[PDB]
Amino acid sequence: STGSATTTPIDSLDDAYITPVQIGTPAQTLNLDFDTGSSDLWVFSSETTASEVDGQTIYTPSKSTTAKLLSGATWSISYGDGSSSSGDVYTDTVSVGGLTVTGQAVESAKKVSSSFTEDSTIDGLLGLAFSTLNTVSPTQQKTFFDNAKASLDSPVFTADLGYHAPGTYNFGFIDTTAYTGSITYTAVSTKQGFWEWTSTGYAVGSGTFKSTSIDGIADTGTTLLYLPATVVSAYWAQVSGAKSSSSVGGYVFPCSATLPSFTFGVGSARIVIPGDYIDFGPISTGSSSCFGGIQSSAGIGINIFGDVALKAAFVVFNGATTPTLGFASK
């Protein structure tokens, strides 16, 4: 089998991407944030505290003839941005782009933190990291990809995120028309539950490439590119007036600037992030200070190749017995 679904930016900045997902019988379609940095499929629901729901579409398990309470199971998750959610668990039929999994754990939120409530466009998350990170207790549950894998034509999914435009998540096949050149594959460590890999270096604009190992994670659920402070300083030093602002929470730059590109290495190959992809717009409405799309990871504990980096590439998440990542230009 295969599946193919379009993923759409939630706003004009590409702050996140939403993909329609069918849950239950008859289908209830929710727009989920596909997140290769976590491993829970959770949704706003008829069980979510009413004051914490503000415009999201909810899953109502009592209206699904295939929903079954997973008795005794609870979940609770906290994300790197400080947001969180928790609740109980059903199993139900879940379809993405024509690919169907029966008995998928659908984690129904009883509580969500303020940032989820405040984002009316995201109805939940669909985790695509390794199932070892799934938070369901006392019986850990598998991701949608893990459940589908054996049925897929090939044990892979691909992320093709657009810049200020829709893109595609494919399951089970690699669309050879969706990228240019060849796909360069690179090793993955699953020891932390992430799609963790080592970039071979970087360049700023037309500058020379610096060969240096940068361990980090391919994370579709993180907006920005988070790299070591040395790398980030070298980038922003090329932008007149850019500075790290403790009050804003990262590097800012004059909105009048034209940003240089940023290149990252994948083995001997190179992925070029155009400068425009690094502009996240005014820090507050009407400001002439703009927020940068490349930020320091120093306070995180891990480097994160988020959407800013991934949207410059066609990315293969290869779930073969030994997982690997592939990157191609497009």
> What is the spatial distance between Cα 205 and Cα 187, in angstroms, rounded to a whole number?
27
As a 3-state breakdown, the chain gives helix, strand, coil percent values, each rounded to 5, of 10, 45, 45
Residue pair 220/161 in contact by the 8 Å Cβ criterion: yes
- Among residues 248, 272, 270, 254, the alpha carbon closest in space to that of 262 is found at 272
> What is the spatial distance between Cα 235 and Cα 220, in angstroms, rounded to a whole number?
22
Dihedrals φ, ψ of 200, to 5°? -90, 0
> What is the spatial distance between Cα 295 and Cα 311, in angstroms, rounded to a whole number?
16
> What is the spatial distance between Cα 161 and Cα 153, in angstroms, rounded to a whole number?
22
> What is the spatial distance between Cα 265 and Cα 199, in angstroms, rounded to a whole number?
5
> What is the spatial distance between Cα 230 and Cα 85, in angstroms, rounded to a whole number?
34
**CA 159 from chain center: how many Å?**
9
The experimental technique used to determine this model is X-ray
> What is the spatial distance between Cα 147 and Cα 139, in angstroms, rounded to a whole number?
15
| Burial (0-12, 13-18, 19+ Cβ within 10 Å), 140 | middle
Neighbours of 12 (CB within 10 A): 8
Q: Is 9 helix (H, G, I), strand (E, B) or coil?
A: strand
> What is the spatial distance between Cα 66 and Cα 22, in angstroms, rounded to a whole number?
13
Q: State in words which class domain 5-174 has.
A: mainly beta
Burial 230-240 (b: 16+ CB within 10 A, else e): ebbebbbebbe
Tokens linked to 44 = 């706003």
Q: Kind and range of the H or E element at 236? A: helix 229-236
- Among residues 227, 180, 4, 202, the alpha carbon closest in space to that of 98 is found at 4
> What is the spatial distance between Cα 329 and Cα 267, in angstroms, rounded to a whole number?
13
Specify whether 287 is catalytic: no
Which among 45, 64, 85, 199 is annotated as catalytic?
199
Residue pair 186/265 in contact by the 8 Å Cβ criterion: no
**CA 219 from chain center: how many Å?**
5
DSSP 242-291: -EEETTTTEEEEETTPPPPPEEEEETTEEEEE-GGGGEEEESSTT-SEEE
Sign of CA dihedral 271, 272, 278, 279: negative
Residue pair 89/113 in contact by the 8 Å Cβ criterion: no
How many residues belong to the chain? 330
Place of tokens 């829970």: 40
Q: Which residues contact 264 (CB under 8 A, 6 or more apart)?
A: 199, 201, 202, 214, 270, 271, 273, 305, 309
- Among residues 327, 295, 64, 87, the alpha carbon closest in space to that of 185 is found at 327
> What is the spatial distance between Cα 148 and Cα 202, in angstroms, rounded to a whole number?
35
Specify whether 45 is catalytic: no
Residue type for 35, please?
D
> What is the spatial distance between Cα 318 and Cα 330, in angstroms, rounded to a whole number?
18
Residue type for 225, please?
L
| CA-CA-CA-CA dihedral for 71, 140, 40, 99, to nearest 10 | -90
Q: Kind and range of the H or E element at 147? A: helix 144-148
Residue type for 159, please?
A
Residue pair 105/136 in contact by the 8 Å Cβ criterion: yes
The CATH superfamily holding the domain 175-330 is Acid Proteases (2.40.70.10)
Tokens linked to 303 = 């480097």
DSSP 63-130: G-TT-EEEEEEEEEEE-TTS-EEEEEEEEEEEEETTEEEEEEEEEEEEEE-HHHHT-TT--EEEE-S-
Residue type for 63, please?
K
CA distance to 27, 84, 106, 118, 266, per residue, from 310 (Å) = 31, 24, 27, 25, 12
Question: Resolution of the deposited coordinates, in angstroms?
Answer: 1.0
Q: Which residues contact 237 (CB under 8 A, 6 or more apart)?
A: none
Which among 14, 33, 35, 40 is annotated as catalytic?
35
Residues of the chain with CATH 2.40.70.10: 5-174, 175-330
Measured over all CA atoms, what is the biggest interatomic distance in the chain, rounded to whole angstroms?
A: 60
